[PDB]
Tab-separated table of C-alpha atoms in Angstrom:
chain	number	residue	atom	x	y	z
Z	3	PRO	CA	-23.065	2.534	12.380
Z	4	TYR	CA	-19.732	2.570	11.257
Z	5	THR	CA	-16.598	1.686	13.964
Z	6	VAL	CA	-13.308	1.482	12.120
Z	7	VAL	CA	-10.475	0.116	14.264
Z	8	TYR	CA	-6.902	1.058	13.243
Z	9	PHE	CA	-3.227	2.374	14.252
Z	10	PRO	CA	-2.861	6.050	14.516
Z	11	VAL	CA	-1.892	6.169	10.729
Z	12	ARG	CA	-3.320	6.595	7.527
Z	13	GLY	CA	-1.975	3.558	6.015
Z	14	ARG	CA	-4.455	1.633	4.463
Z	15	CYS	CA	-7.594	3.220	5.940
Z	16	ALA	CA	-6.769	6.231	4.239
Z	17	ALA	CA	-9.082	5.170	1.507
Z	18	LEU	CA	-12.112	4.034	3.190
Z	19	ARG	CA	-11.962	6.951	5.431
Z	20	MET	CA	-11.818	9.200	2.042
Z	21	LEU	CA	-14.841	7.039	0.840
Z	22	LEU	CA	-17.051	7.427	4.144
Z	23	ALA	CA	-16.046	11.037	4.394
Z	24	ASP	CA	-17.079	11.830	0.750
Z	25	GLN	CA	-20.295	9.872	0.715
Z	26	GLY	CA	-21.523	11.743	3.879
Z	27	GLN	CA	-21.325	8.970	6.299
Z	28	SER	CA	-20.275	9.113	9.974
Z	29	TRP	CA	-18.219	6.615	11.525
Z	30	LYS	CA	-16.483	6.390	15.042
Z	31	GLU	CA	-12.544	5.612	15.092
Z	32	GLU	CA	-10.806	3.354	17.804
Z	33	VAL	CA	-7.204	3.699	18.090
Z	34	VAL	CA	-4.814	0.970	18.475
Z	35	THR	CA	-1.796	2.264	20.018
Z	36	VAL	CA	1.235	-0.044	19.763
Z	50	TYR	CA	-6.978	-12.136	10.834
Z	52	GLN	CA	-3.195	-7.193	11.045
Z	53	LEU	CA	-5.953	-4.293	11.379
Z	54	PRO	CA	-7.972	-2.476	9.995
Z	55	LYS	CA	-11.175	-3.923	11.734
Z	56	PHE	CA	-14.713	-2.508	10.497
Z	57	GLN	CA	-17.972	-2.967	12.222
Z	58	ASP	CA	-21.038	-1.994	10.393
Z	59	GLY	CA	-23.580	-2.944	12.798
Z	60	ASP	CA	-23.036	-6.534	14.272
Z	61	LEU	CA	-21.263	-7.241	11.076
Z	62	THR	CA	-17.233	-7.327	11.844
Z	63	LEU	CA	-15.148	-7.142	8.602
Z	64	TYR	CA	-10.968	-7.275	8.580
Z	65	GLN	CA	-8.943	-6.738	5.492
Z	66	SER	CA	-9.067	-3.037	3.892
Z	67	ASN	CA	-9.999	-4.435	0.275
Z	68	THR	CA	-13.126	-6.233	1.887
Z	69	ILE	CA	-14.263	-3.187	3.645
Z	70	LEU	CA	-13.622	-0.915	0.505
Z	71	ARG	CA	-16.005	-3.608	-1.404
Z	72	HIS	CA	-18.314	-3.782	1.491
Z	73	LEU	CA	-19.007	-0.187	1.500
Z	74	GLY	CA	-18.918	-0.392	-2.532
Z	75	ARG	CA	-21.773	-2.764	-2.316
Z	76	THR	CA	-24.097	-1.246	0.227
Z	77	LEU	CA	-23.179	2.483	-0.555
Z	78	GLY	CA	-23.752	1.729	-4.522
Z	79	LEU	CA	-19.862	2.628	-5.593
Z	80	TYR	CA	-19.588	-0.705	-7.450
Z	81	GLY	CA	-20.467	0.155	-10.842
Z	82	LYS	CA	-23.587	0.502	-12.870
Z	83	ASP	CA	-23.291	-3.388	-14.367
Z	84	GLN	CA	-21.448	-6.539	-13.657
Z	85	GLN	CA	-19.198	-5.462	-16.611
Z	86	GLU	CA	-18.228	-2.597	-14.675
Z	87	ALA	CA	-18.030	-4.489	-11.292
Z	88	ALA	CA	-15.531	-6.584	-12.953
Z	89	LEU	CA	-13.311	-3.846	-14.301
Z	90	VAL	CA	-13.372	-1.917	-10.744
Z	91	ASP	CA	-12.127	-4.819	-9.084
Z	92	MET	CA	-9.476	-5.362	-11.623
Z	93	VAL	CA	-8.184	-1.449	-11.064
Z	94	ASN	CA	-8.775	-2.068	-7.394
Z	95	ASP	CA	-6.654	-4.868	-7.712
Z	96	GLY	CA	-3.764	-3.244	-9.629
Z	97	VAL	CA	-3.738	-0.253	-7.109
Z	98	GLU	CA	-3.604	-3.184	-4.343
Z	99	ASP	CA	-0.434	-4.787	-6.123
Z	100	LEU	CA	1.281	-1.381	-6.380
Z	101	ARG	CA	0.574	-0.499	-2.593
Z	102	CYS	CA	2.477	-3.940	-1.870
Z	103	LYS	CA	5.269	-2.847	-3.281
Z	104	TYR	CA	5.117	0.818	-1.789
Z	105	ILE	CA	4.557	-0.943	1.755
Z	106	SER	CA	7.431	-3.153	1.165
Z	107	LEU	CA	9.892	-0.279	0.310
Z	108	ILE	CA	8.639	1.654	3.233
Z	109	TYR	CA	9.016	-1.136	6.035
Z	110	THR	CA	11.876	-3.154	4.121
Z	111	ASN	CA	14.296	-1.549	1.707
Z	112	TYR	CA	13.429	2.047	1.885
Z	113	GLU	CA	16.991	3.515	2.246
Z	114	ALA	CA	18.381	1.399	-0.683
Z	115	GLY	CA	15.361	0.432	-2.678
Z	116	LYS	CA	13.992	4.123	-2.956
Z	117	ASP	CA	16.037	5.052	-6.045
Z	118	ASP	CA	15.107	1.740	-8.093
Z	119	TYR	CA	11.383	2.096	-7.212
Z	120	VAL	CA	11.141	5.745	-8.582
Z	121	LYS	CA	12.968	4.908	-11.566
Z	122	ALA	CA	10.416	1.977	-12.342
Z	123	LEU	CA	7.416	4.031	-10.849
Z	124	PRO	CA	6.641	5.409	-14.312
Z	125	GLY	CA	5.973	1.872	-15.621
Z	126	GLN	CA	3.994	1.376	-12.717
Z	127	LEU	CA	1.713	4.218	-13.208
Z	128	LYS	CA	1.348	4.106	-17.188
Z	129	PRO	CA	-1.600	1.140	-16.896
Z	130	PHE	CA	-3.868	3.367	-15.196
Z	131	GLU	CA	-3.141	6.482	-17.645
Z	132	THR	CA	-4.052	4.219	-20.271
Z	133	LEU	CA	-7.041	2.995	-18.506
Z	134	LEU	CA	-8.143	6.619	-17.828
Z	135	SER	CA	-7.610	7.427	-21.605
Z	136	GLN	CA	-9.840	4.572	-22.846
Z	137	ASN	CA	-12.894	5.993	-20.811
Z	138	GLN	CA	-14.178	9.063	-22.104
Z	139	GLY	CA	-10.619	10.457	-22.481
Z	140	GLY	CA	-10.161	10.554	-18.736
Z	141	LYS	CA	-12.662	13.006	-17.996
Z	142	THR	CA	-14.651	11.408	-15.652
Z	143	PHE	CA	-13.717	8.557	-13.323
Z	144	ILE	CA	-11.118	5.279	-13.494
Z	145	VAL	CA	-14.258	3.323	-14.383
Z	146	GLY	CA	-17.763	4.178	-15.690
Z	147	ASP	CA	-19.349	7.491	-15.453
Z	148	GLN	CA	-19.715	7.414	-11.607
Z	149	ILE	CA	-17.519	7.379	-8.495
Z	150	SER	CA	-16.610	3.608	-7.273
Z	151	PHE	CA	-14.402	2.657	-4.261
Z	152	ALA	CA	-11.794	1.866	-6.484
Z	153	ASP	CA	-11.306	5.734	-7.212
Z	154	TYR	CA	-10.799	6.436	-3.406
Z	155	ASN	CA	-8.076	3.823	-3.430
Z	156	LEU	CA	-6.465	4.908	-6.468
Z	157	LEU	CA	-6.632	8.710	-5.362
Z	158	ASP	CA	-4.867	7.455	-2.161
Z	159	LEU	CA	-2.041	5.365	-4.041
Z	160	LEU	CA	-1.214	8.399	-6.273
Z	161	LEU	CA	-1.158	10.956	-3.450
Z	162	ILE	CA	0.928	9.033	-1.076
Z	163	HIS	CA	3.346	8.476	-4.227
Z	164	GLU	CA	3.413	12.178	-4.945
Z	165	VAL	CA	5.015	12.625	-1.644
Z	166	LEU	CA	7.512	9.821	-1.959
Z	167	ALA	CA	8.354	11.163	-5.567
Z	168	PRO	CA	6.870	14.427	-6.080
Z	169	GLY	CA	6.436	15.415	-9.627
Z	170	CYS	CA	5.978	11.535	-10.476
Z	171	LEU	CA	2.538	12.387	-11.860
Z	172	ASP	CA	3.724	15.367	-14.232
Z	173	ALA	CA	4.473	12.642	-16.973
Z	174	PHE	CA	0.744	11.681	-17.001
Z	175	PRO	CA	-1.583	14.371	-17.735
Z	176	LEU	CA	-4.795	12.267	-17.236
Z	177	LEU	CA	-3.834	11.020	-13.786
Z	178	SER	CA	-2.810	14.619	-12.650
Z	179	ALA	CA	-6.142	16.120	-13.859
Z	180	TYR	CA	-8.124	13.027	-12.308
Z	181	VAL	CA	-6.098	13.685	-8.849
Z	182	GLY	CA	-7.082	17.322	-9.234
Z	183	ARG	CA	-10.759	16.704	-10.341
Z	184	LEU	CA	-11.334	14.200	-7.401
Z	185	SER	CA	-9.411	16.335	-4.726
Z	186	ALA	CA	-11.734	19.262	-5.546
Z	187	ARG	CA	-14.940	17.402	-4.457
Z	188	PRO	CA	-16.729	19.479	-1.802
Z	189	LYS	CA	-16.834	16.652	1.297
Z	190	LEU	CA	-13.573	15.113	0.023
Z	191	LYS	CA	-11.473	18.297	-0.146
Z	192	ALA	CA	-12.773	19.418	3.430
Z	193	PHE	CA	-11.669	15.972	4.671
Z	194	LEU	CA	-8.329	16.119	3.228
Z	195	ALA	CA	-7.704	19.528	4.608
Z	196	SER	CA	-8.917	18.379	8.402
Z	197	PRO	CA	-6.350	17.872	11.259
Z	198	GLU	CA	-8.098	14.254	11.149
Z	199	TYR	CA	-6.295	13.539	8.090
Z	200	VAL	CA	-3.391	16.164	7.795
Z	201	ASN	CA	-1.783	15.279	11.398
Z	202	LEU	CA	-1.614	11.424	11.174
Z	203	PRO	CA	1.712	10.120	9.731
Z	204	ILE	CA	1.212	8.348	6.397
Z	205	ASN	CA	3.176	4.981	7.834
Z	206	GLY	CA	3.906	3.673	10.911
Z	207	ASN	CA	7.767	3.511	10.686
Z	208	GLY	CA	7.450	7.155	10.440
Z	209	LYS	CA	8.840	7.122	6.665
Z	210	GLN	CA	7.116	8.301	3.616
K	3	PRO	CA	-17.735	-18.620	-24.340
K	4	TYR	CA	-14.820	-18.445	-21.919
K	5	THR	CA	-11.373	-18.518	-22.734
K	6	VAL	CA	-8.431	-18.449	-20.264
K	7	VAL	CA	-4.875	-17.408	-21.162
K	8	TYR	CA	-2.056	-18.948	-18.863
K	9	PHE	CA	1.017	-20.823	-18.597
K	10	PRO	CA	1.088	-24.768	-18.562
K	11	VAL	CA	0.644	-24.789	-14.786
K	12	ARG	CA	-2.191	-25.008	-12.409
K	13	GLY	CA	-0.771	-21.945	-10.549
K	14	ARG	CA	-3.381	-19.232	-9.868
K	15	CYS	CA	-5.864	-20.710	-12.621
K	16	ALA	CA	-6.657	-24.022	-10.439
K	17	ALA	CA	-9.304	-22.304	-8.532
K	18	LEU	CA	-11.353	-21.003	-11.294
K	19	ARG	CA	-10.547	-24.047	-13.449
K	20	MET	CA	-12.356	-26.114	-10.930
K	21	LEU	CA	-15.073	-23.092	-10.391
K	22	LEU	CA	-15.978	-23.709	-14.178
K	23	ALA	CA	-15.656	-27.391	-14.242
K	24	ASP	CA	-17.736	-27.802	-11.186
K	25	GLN	CA	-20.666	-25.315	-12.460
K	26	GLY	CA	-20.714	-27.500	-15.696
K	27	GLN	CA	-19.189	-24.350	-17.753
K	28	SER	CA	-17.267	-24.910	-20.574
K	29	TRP	CA	-14.109	-23.034	-21.581
K	30	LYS	CA	-11.125	-22.815	-24.219
K	31	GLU	CA	-7.992	-22.997	-22.879
K	32	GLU	CA	-4.735	-21.006	-24.381
K	33	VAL	CA	-1.349	-22.011	-23.451
K	34	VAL	CA	1.253	-19.152	-22.722
K	35	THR	CA	4.639	-20.965	-23.305
K	36	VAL	CA	7.838	-18.909	-21.948
K	50	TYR	CA	-1.786	-5.599	-16.128
K	52	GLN	CA	1.456	-11.403	-15.401
K	53	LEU	CA	-1.419	-13.660	-16.359
K	54	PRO	CA	-4.279	-15.157	-16.156
K	55	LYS	CA	-6.420	-13.320	-18.839
K	56	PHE	CA	-9.853	-14.203	-19.053
K	57	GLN	CA	-12.144	-13.460	-22.110
K	58	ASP	CA	-15.845	-13.589	-21.189
K	59	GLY	CA	-17.395	-12.451	-24.283
K	60	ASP	CA	-15.736	-9.409	-25.262
K	61	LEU	CA	-15.152	-8.658	-21.613
K	62	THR	CA	-11.170	-9.069	-20.884
K	63	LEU	CA	-10.192	-9.428	-16.982
K	64	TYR	CA	-6.923	-9.908	-15.894
K	65	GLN	CA	-5.689	-10.808	-12.019
K	66	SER	CA	-7.020	-14.452	-10.652
K	67	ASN	CA	-9.034	-12.902	-8.146
K	68	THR	CA	-11.147	-10.434	-10.097
K	69	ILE	CA	-12.075	-13.481	-12.649
K	70	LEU	CA	-13.122	-15.332	-9.515
K	71	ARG	CA	-15.294	-12.495	-8.398
K	72	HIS	CA	-16.521	-12.099	-11.621
K	73	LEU	CA	-17.805	-15.686	-12.261
K	74	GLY	CA	-18.812	-15.424	-8.767
K	75	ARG	CA	-21.163	-12.552	-9.678
K	76	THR	CA	-22.399	-13.871	-12.867
K	77	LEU	CA	-22.687	-17.593	-11.541
K	78	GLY	CA	-24.234	-16.744	-8.339
K	79	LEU	CA	-21.487	-17.772	-6.227
K	80	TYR	CA	-21.249	-14.916	-4.000
K	81	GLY	CA	-23.521	-15.271	-1.085
K	82	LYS	CA	-26.989	-15.129	-0.837
K	83	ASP	CA	-26.925	-11.413	0.518
K	84	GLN	CA	-24.463	-8.525	1.463
K	85	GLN	CA	-23.485	-9.953	4.309
K	86	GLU	CA	-22.777	-13.155	3.226
K	87	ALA	CA	-20.939	-11.700	0.362
K	88	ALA	CA	-18.728	-9.716	2.810
K	89	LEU	CA	-17.665	-12.849	4.278
K	90	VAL	CA	-17.160	-14.309	1.272
K	91	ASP	CA	-14.561	-11.678	0.237
K	92	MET	CA	-12.924	-11.778	3.784
K	93	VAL	CA	-12.476	-15.449	3.581
K	94	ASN	CA	-11.192	-15.331	-0.254
K	95	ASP	CA	-8.552	-12.068	0.852
K	96	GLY	CA	-7.191	-14.410	3.808
K	97	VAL	CA	-6.630	-17.344	1.286
K	98	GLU	CA	-5.035	-15.053	-1.250
K	99	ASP	CA	-2.901	-13.737	1.842
K	100	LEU	CA	-1.626	-17.350	2.506
K	101	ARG	CA	-1.303	-18.002	-1.070
K	102	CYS	CA	1.156	-15.044	-1.332
K	103	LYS	CA	3.560	-16.760	1.236
K	104	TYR	CA	3.440	-19.924	-0.613
K	105	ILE	CA	4.222	-18.275	-3.972
K	106	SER	CA	7.051	-16.445	-1.948
K	107	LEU	CA	8.133	-19.952	-0.439
K	108	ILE	CA	7.928	-21.807	-3.785
K	109	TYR	CA	9.865	-19.115	-6.117
K	110	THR	CA	11.947	-17.339	-3.406
K	111	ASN	CA	13.190	-19.249	-0.179
K	112	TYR	CA	11.930	-22.774	-1.102
K	113	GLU	CA	15.220	-24.516	0.451
K	114	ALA	CA	15.780	-22.661	3.831
K	115	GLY	CA	12.281	-21.352	4.290
K	116	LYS	CA	10.168	-24.794	3.816
K	117	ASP	CA	11.224	-25.693	7.500
K	118	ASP	CA	10.054	-22.599	9.187
K	119	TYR	CA	6.764	-22.158	6.724
K	120	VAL	CA	5.489	-25.575	8.091
K	121	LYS	CA	5.968	-24.772	11.457
K	122	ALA	CA	4.048	-21.830	10.746
K	123	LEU	CA	1.195	-23.450	9.220
K	124	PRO	CA	-0.833	-24.494	11.675
K	125	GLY	CA	-1.287	-20.854	12.693
K	126	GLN	CA	-2.416	-20.055	9.197
K	127	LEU	CA	-4.867	-22.811	8.829
K	128	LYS	CA	-6.579	-22.272	12.424
K	129	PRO	CA	-8.557	-19.284	11.582
K	130	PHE	CA	-10.250	-21.319	8.471
K	131	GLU	CA	-11.052	-24.218	11.025
K	132	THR	CA	-12.399	-21.755	13.209
K	133	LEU	CA	-14.517	-20.034	10.651
K	134	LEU	CA	-15.679	-23.560	9.753
K	135	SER	CA	-16.890	-24.259	13.075
K	136	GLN	CA	-18.985	-21.059	13.386
K	137	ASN	CA	-21.067	-22.216	10.244
K	138	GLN	CA	-23.349	-25.062	11.334
K	139	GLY	CA	-20.551	-26.800	12.593
K	140	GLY	CA	-18.345	-26.804	9.429
K	141	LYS	CA	-21.285	-29.165	7.957
K	142	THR	CA	-21.469	-27.385	4.639
K	143	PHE	CA	-19.367	-24.592	2.987
K	144	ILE	CA	-16.906	-22.005	4.616
K	145	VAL	CA	-19.714	-19.348	4.251
K	146	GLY	CA	-23.393	-19.880	3.952
K	147	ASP	CA	-24.993	-22.965	2.902
K	148	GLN	CA	-24.148	-22.540	-0.427
K	149	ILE	CA	-21.000	-23.012	-2.405
K	150	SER	CA	-19.211	-19.581	-3.010
K	151	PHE	CA	-16.156	-19.005	-5.485
K	152	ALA	CA	-14.075	-18.950	-2.027
K	153	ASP	CA	-14.660	-22.421	-1.565
K	154	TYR	CA	-13.062	-23.292	-4.733
K	155	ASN	CA	-10.329	-21.043	-3.840
K	156	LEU	CA	-9.614	-22.541	-0.399
K	157	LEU	CA	-9.901	-26.203	-1.503
K	158	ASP	CA	-7.057	-25.056	-4.061
K	159	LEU	CA	-4.973	-23.515	-1.190
K	160	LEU	CA	-5.600	-26.647	1.074
K	161	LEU	CA	-4.736	-29.189	-1.580
K	162	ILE	CA	-1.588	-27.615	-2.781
K	163	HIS	CA	-0.455	-27.564	0.969
K	164	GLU	CA	-1.255	-31.292	1.717
K	165	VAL	CA	1.220	-31.657	-1.134
K	166	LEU	CA	3.970	-29.353	0.538
K	167	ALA	CA	3.374	-30.652	4.112
K	168	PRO	CA	1.229	-34.037	3.761
K	169	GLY	CA	-0.619	-34.599	6.933
K	170	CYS	CA	-0.790	-30.749	7.637
K	171	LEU	CA	-4.774	-31.129	7.488
K	172	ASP	CA	-4.670	-33.962	10.339
K	173	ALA	CA	-4.787	-31.246	13.244
K	174	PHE	CA	-8.009	-29.974	11.941
K	175	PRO	CA	-10.947	-32.234	11.688
K	176	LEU	CA	-13.230	-29.904	9.936
K	177	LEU	CA	-10.891	-28.670	7.192
K	178	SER	CA	-10.127	-32.388	6.486
K	179	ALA	CA	-13.931	-33.222	6.178
K	180	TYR	CA	-14.415	-30.154	4.382
K	181	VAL	CA	-11.689	-30.921	1.648
K	182	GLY	CA	-13.283	-34.508	1.319
K	183	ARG	CA	-16.763	-33.347	1.297
K	184	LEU	CA	-16.118	-30.941	-1.720
K	185	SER	CA	-13.791	-33.138	-3.317
K	186	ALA	CA	-16.375	-35.578	-3.913
K	187	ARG	CA	-18.675	-33.196	-5.755
K	188	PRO	CA	-19.442	-35.032	-8.892
K	189	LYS	CA	-18.200	-32.918	-11.709
K	190	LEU	CA	-15.266	-31.660	-9.394
K	191	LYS	CA	-14.005	-35.104	-8.777
K	192	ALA	CA	-14.154	-35.902	-12.067
K	193	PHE	CA	-11.965	-32.837	-13.229
K	194	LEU	CA	-9.760	-33.307	-10.334
K	195	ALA	CA	-8.930	-36.629	-11.774
K	196	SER	CA	-8.545	-35.756	-15.412
K	197	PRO	CA	-5.149	-35.409	-17.181
K	198	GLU	CA	-6.126	-31.811	-17.689
K	199	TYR	CA	-5.684	-31.068	-14.100
K	200	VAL	CA	-3.518	-34.253	-13.058
K	201	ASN	CA	-0.808	-33.818	-15.361
K	202	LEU	CA	0.160	-30.058	-15.092
K	203	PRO	CA	2.535	-29.070	-12.679
K	204	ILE	CA	1.239	-26.917	-9.766
K	205	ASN	CA	4.135	-24.265	-10.100
K	206	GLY	CA	6.724	-23.124	-12.849
K	207	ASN	CA	9.882	-23.451	-11.356
K	208	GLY	CA	8.855	-27.285	-10.871
K	209	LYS	CA	8.642	-27.035	-7.131
K	210	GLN	CA	5.744	-28.032	-4.937
């Protein structure tokens, strides 16, 4: 019984959509043509804030680590992703024309921490945290994909990340969703820039 | 076995310090004179990001709601607080001189949601969520206190919030901590503005 209310763009819902899709859950979309959405309805539970939804789905669907220690790392990784996403959103809607240059120059410094974190966990052979997927993976994967569109090839300097994007992108239900019109035909951002 | 590494300012640690103080936990500070701190060490567990720490302490100290439903609301409230805190931080370090005017004009619109949320929970007679304190309370309380310093009297238009700040501020261990030199003598912000 899931319903997500959002604009007709992937934006901040791409991650939770991927999460739902991959976990084999069904939801109802509810477009909003022109607390800022998304809005999520789980039964009579009504959530706002994308990360709130991600954690909620994480708790209830068991994508929050195997113990309190991992849970903390998952949060820490998610917050980093979120931090970078804020810069991206700022670039897109604010200084896209001028900032794009400087942004890509700095991108490697922004992505290196993730590469490191990956190397520290079974040599990046599984997920960003632990040996099971978590909501932070779906969110990290989205951040990496939307960046490969802004600056194609940015992930070439990071062997672990690139393998990671490939590993996750190949997950049965996820691959299908990523290839669906439902995903492919939605613009990444509202202002039409990406 | 807690250690918090941060600058010599309350900044983003005020909340977790209040949390620790109120919960009767002891920690070791480690000043950093001139992932951006804080850094938290719980045993060999090393966390970064203030909210990550807040959730961690929330999970382990049982300040995360009584069930998954409340947990979600706690997150939702915390994210709202965090959203406003980002604006505050932006005012302080960026457009303080000019933005202060417009900021205070808009403040009521920013605080109204919290007043509402409060009224919806036992008529604001307990905490922001549920009938037990949660990490979001400590974080909300900090946000309200630092605002009463920026724009004194801003809470007069909201009876529920004002009672809330008074109710929590009177908590035995919290009142003491709020009166300690450890708290009182630390500047609110780095740039010396508040």
